[PDB]
Amino acid sequence: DWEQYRDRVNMLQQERIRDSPLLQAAKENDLRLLKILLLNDFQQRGAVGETALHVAALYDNLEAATLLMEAAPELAKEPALCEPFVGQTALHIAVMNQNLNLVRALLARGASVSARATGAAFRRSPHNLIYYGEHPLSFAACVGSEEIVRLLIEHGADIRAQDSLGNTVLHILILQPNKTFACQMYNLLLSYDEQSLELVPNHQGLTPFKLAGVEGNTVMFQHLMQKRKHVQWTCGPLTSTLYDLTEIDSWGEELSFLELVVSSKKREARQILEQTPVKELVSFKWKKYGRPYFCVLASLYILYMICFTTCCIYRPLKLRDDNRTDPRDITILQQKLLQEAYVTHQDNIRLVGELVTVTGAVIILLLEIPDIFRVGASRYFGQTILGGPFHVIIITYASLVLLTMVMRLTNMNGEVVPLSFALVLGWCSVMYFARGFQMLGPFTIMIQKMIFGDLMRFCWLMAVVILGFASAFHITFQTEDPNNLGEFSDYPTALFSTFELFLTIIDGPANYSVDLPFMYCITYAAFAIIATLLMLNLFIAMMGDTHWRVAQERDELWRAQVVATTVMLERKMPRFLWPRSGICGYEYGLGDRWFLRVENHH
Amino acid sequence: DWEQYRDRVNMLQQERIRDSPLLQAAKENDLRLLKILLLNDFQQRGAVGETALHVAALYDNLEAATLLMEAAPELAKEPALCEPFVGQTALHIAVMNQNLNLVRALLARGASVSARATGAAFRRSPHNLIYYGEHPLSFAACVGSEEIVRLLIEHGADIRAQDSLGNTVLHILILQPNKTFACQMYNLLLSYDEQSLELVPNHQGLTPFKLAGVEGNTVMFQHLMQKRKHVQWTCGPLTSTLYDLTEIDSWGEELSFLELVVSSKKREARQILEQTPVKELVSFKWKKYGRPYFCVLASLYILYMICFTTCCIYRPLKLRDDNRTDPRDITILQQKLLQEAYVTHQDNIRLVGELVTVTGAVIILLLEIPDIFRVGASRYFGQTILGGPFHVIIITYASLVLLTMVMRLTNMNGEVVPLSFALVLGWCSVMYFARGFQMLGPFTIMIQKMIFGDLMRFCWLMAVVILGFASAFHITFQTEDPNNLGEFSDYPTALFSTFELFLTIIDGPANYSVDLPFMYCITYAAFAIIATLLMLNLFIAMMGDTHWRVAQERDELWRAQVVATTVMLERKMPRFLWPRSGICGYEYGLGDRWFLRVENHH
Ligand SMILES: CC(C)[C@@H](C)/C=C/[C@@H](C)[C@H]1CC[C@H]2C3=CC=C4C[C@@H](O)CC[C@]4(C)[C@H]3CC[C@]12C
Ligand SMILES: CC(C)[C@@H](C)/C=C/[C@@H](C)[C@H]1CC[C@H]2C3=CC=C4C[C@@H](O)CC[C@]4(C)[C@H]3CC[C@]12C
Ligand SMILES: CC(C)[C@@H](C)/C=C/[C@@H](C)[C@H]1CC[C@H]2C3=CC=C4C[C@@H](O)CC[C@]4(C)[C@H]3CC[C@]12C
Ligand SMILES: CC(C)[C@@H](C)/C=C/[C@@H](C)[C@H]1CC[C@H]2C3=CC=C4C[C@@H](O)CC[C@]4(C)[C@H]3CC[C@]12C
């Protein structure tokens, strides 16, 4: 694995230092021995192709480093050579150690300011505890050294330089934990840009501004907004400000800033939506267009489900041609064949409802399937914010409807099976529209967080308890007459009865007109204590204990689902229903830009 | 008892001081009277064989002590003589009182630095509020007096000296509450050791390092780690450190450090497992070997339970030879005798499943019973962390399986009884494997903490309520026809029905075709209010109120169960499946030691 390999690389590096007297002296800073060694091989390389001057820079030994450079000035220009450290120079190491005097001493000897630390230790990865890109300037900026950054710019470090992810030093600063020092560095780097470095995309296609949204860097986002706002006036406690919408509203682009924020896997990304500019734009969009249109789509989908339900109530059945020869058989009706299912005016009225049902199932797939491809299936079905579990069940519903149509056209028996699933999944998918309402939306997120959390854990241990007790009840009743107590008469019935008895949805079996086996009363007393008194009430207790913890995240997720709905509706609906948001600058001599005006009290 | 004896010892001591003018003067420090007394018996002894110089040292009376020593220098060498205080000298007392000048005055007169306070007041026990071992140096160290410790070392106090538990001053310092001052003292004492005192075991077989793990002394453990770590390099925000695994991983030893920590009765011991070295070693062991092998053992045990369950479903039964002459008798099948139970190919297929069932029951006892002997039964079955309640039920399961085999071989009727218990206990023991999963493990600890806590308290008061109401319902129905209401027709049925009615698992008995006794409606209304409205819902309330309090400990116990599982699997499984953990130093010129490399951000 990567851990045992990186560990071995570090062990070999330390051994090759111990085993080589020049590298050992470069580590210890014992100038005595280092003078004797250098007085009479300077190109000695440690385990990763690093020089004695890399070793001196790592241990921050300026005296050993200057003594090595006086003996062999060429060492300042040397990269390391083996996979984790490829392209790392002594300048990269000195910059990480913030040794300004060693950085001056290396630059005075022509250490390259444009050298790339290409190796696996510098790539953005869960394997690496930091990501500073590949260039000495990016290292100096992430390390927070203003003076080393100026010094590197004065030696001609290219501020536009991009690493193997396409990230510029501005993208790399958005990715750092030290957000306030990163904002101070971001102004310093923007000062040397006199087309802008803020507009350069990485290989994901993201500008620094879009990356601050995706990564949920609210401190860098509100900093980037200071160059995109204009204060129109202040009057006593009131200010009117005008915010440039260009990089937020993302007009005509296939993948907007707001879509990149609501579809981001970073939990912090949803905090960008609470910023004054994003929140007030998405609140306006939801008030004026999103809620009205989402209420119309909720209404149309409910009418479509009432239509489909009515087609199931009026489903074509006839008297069974076969005989109920078995006394346990209760089936009296049967499916009509296709050639006898469409005869009456009522069958033609149902054919219109069935054609509406099939048309809406086709429309669901035409609306759903392209968004799987845009978003990618694991992000599309996985994200709560986008509607993930509802997309699974609405596609499953449309698939079961089209399967049922194939069964109807082919005289296939058993339409009850896909129709019963489609009635449950079709109606449960009406809970998708709960996101439009503050009353229902946060509660629908609790339902989901309880299904994937507490209900999952419970059903795993509940199933183990049901297997034990169903088997004990079944073998307890194997010797007894099934007509006097039916609940455990075969093993599938014993499982189902034990499941219903666990949940207390069927009464505990009793028949006071006969002697039940004594082992039933013993087993059922233990079951009643374990399943109903303890586990069924402990479920309520652990749900109550989850509920108060999850409640703050439930509300943050609901507010983000409203924005994701707004972004989805504006993307998918006809543009004549969604007029461009904010204020057109061309009406006021401000150019082609669009704005949001926010007036606030302070 | 010990309390009334120690109290009497203290009362007699104070009386013998009051009754003896020299000891009374040694307590008061009235040098006037003490001069008159000493001018013309110095060997006067208080209630515990203590001298007037012990009394002067106890009351911290340096002037009386020096005046007593000037009259009788031999008193500095005297021990106390009666059971609680045997071997205590005036030096032990002066050291506890931190009187450096009295310690100098006693050492100047040859008070023994190697004297042992052998008496019952100095032994590690719940009877004693402190434990400083038996020697003046251990007293000075636990009292925290650096200057008295140096002074005693300068007078030749043996730093290797061991008390009646085999504890050295280092072991005794791990046992003190003042952990940060104890670490400062631990460095001072290690400085005089120039085979090491850190390697000396006590009579439990524990070194100071193992004792810090067992006692959960995380402050002393992280201090002891500072002499067992090497910083390989630091580069900007990153450091790589190498930790010596020798005393943690405990190779080839019959009882490891990690086993001593997970099996400790101290609740603080589980905090040692969260230290960087222990946590990262046990996390690696669990990731690479523990979880994969525990998932295989979970799978094999579930397949074994499905096999046993199938042998119970296909259990050999025939039509009853006897007649159902009683109209209340519902038994229609009976056990086959052994000589008719193995005839068909299906019986031979079941014999293979029954031989697998018996083989796994023998294997369970071969795996379980030796670990009872290693750990000791009360620690083995008592500890949640080790699997205690699951070890009880898995041994009970294997015992019921082997009992059932003896019943099968002997034509003994009633195999339903041990098989019904074995099906419940065998399946409920699958919850042992819940510890391997973050989803199920903490919840399985809540199940256990609720069974032993809230369910226990509830079942005690619930039983008292059922006894009252079952008796009232039984005598209410004694005069009435059992065929019209069967629930209370005899006292065992009335108990069982009242138990099912308490839990609301059977419907309240009613028969609108007859007049029930009016006393039933009155009694059942009171029962319905007390049992179902109040107590059954108050159970949910007290569980909810336990759940939020226990939730932090539940997670700490789960994280410790994962480590205990890892330690158990590595101990019990073949060593070719468990390669030695960490980094072999011999590959890198570091010797025979093994290491963990931890790289961290700061
Ligand atoms: C035998 C059939 C009828 C079985 C398989 C049916 C199961 C359905 C009812 C289950 C499967 C997944 C469940 C489910 C998935 C996720 C969510 C999202 C949550 O925010 C609201 C509830 C909701 C919508 C629930 C409702 C009930 C569903 C849809
Ligand atoms: C406890 C958790 C794990 C939940 C999810 C599981 C419930 C189990 C016990 C349920 C789920 C569906 C149930 C089920 C489905 C349908 C039938 C067909 C019927 O003719 C006999 C019973 C039988 C075979 C029952 C047995 C019990 C089952 C398998
Ligand atoms: C009449 C028989 C069937 C009676 C005696 C059976 C009782 C069983 C089901 C009881 C006895 C002890 C109970 C028990 C003991 C302790 C634990 C550990 C806990 O972390 C998970 C639940 C678990 C495993 C439960 C499950 C149910 C058990 C095993
Ligand atoms: C309320 C708590 C204390 C729980 C643990 C106790 C429940 C009691 C009421 C249960 C446990 C087992 C039950 C029980 C076992 C088996 C039988 C044999 C049956 O032919 C008559 C009823 C009888 C005798 C009932 C009576 C009620 C008992 C004794």
Curated annotation (Swiss-Prot), chains A, B:
Interaction with S100A10, as annotated region: 563-567
Effect of D507A: Abolishes Ca(2+) permeation and Ca(2+)-dependent current decay; no effect on monovalent cations permeation
Placement of ANK repeats on the sequence: 17-44, 48-77, 86-115, 132-161, 165-194, 204-233
Binding site for Ca(2+): D507
Nucleus is among the record's keywords: no
Activity control note: Activated by WNK3.
Cytoplasmic side: 1-292, 374-384, 435-457
Post-translational modification (record): Glycosylated.
Annotated compartments: Cell membrane; Apical cell membrane
Intramembrane residues: 489-509
Mutagenesis or variant effect for D507K: Abolishes channel activity
Effect upon mutating D515A: Minor effects on Ca(2+) permeation
UniProt tissue specificity: Detected in kidney cortex, in distal convoluted tubules and cortical collecting ducts (at protein level). Detected in duodenum, jejunum, ileum, kidney and placenta.
UniProt keyword Chaperone, yes or no: no
Catalytic activity reported: Ca(2+)(in) = Ca(2+)(out)
Family: Belongs to the transient receptor (TC 1.A.4) family. TrpV subfamily. TRPV5 sub-subfamily.
Subunit structure: Homotetramer. Probably forms heterotetramers with TRPV6. Interacts with TRPV6. Interacts with S100A10 and probably with the ANAX2-S100A10 heterotetramer. The interaction with S100A10 is required for the trafficking to the plasma membrane. Interacts with calmodulin. Interacts with BSPRY, which results in its inactivation.
Record function comment: Constitutively active calcium selective cation channel thought to be involved in Ca(2+) reabsorption in kidney and intestine. Required for normal Ca(2+) reabsorption in the kidney distal convoluted tubules. The channel is activated by low internal calcium level and the current exhibits an inward rectification. A Ca(2+)-dependent feedback regulation includes fast channel inactivation and slow current decay. Heteromeric assembly with TRPV6 seems to modify channel properties. TRPV5-TRPV6 heteromultimeric concatemers exhibit voltage-dependent gating.
Name of the protein in question: Transient receptor potential cation channel subfamily V member 5
Protein's organism: Oryctolagus cuniculus (Rabbit)
Name of the gene this protein is made from: Trpv5
Residues of the full protein shown: 28 to 637 of 730
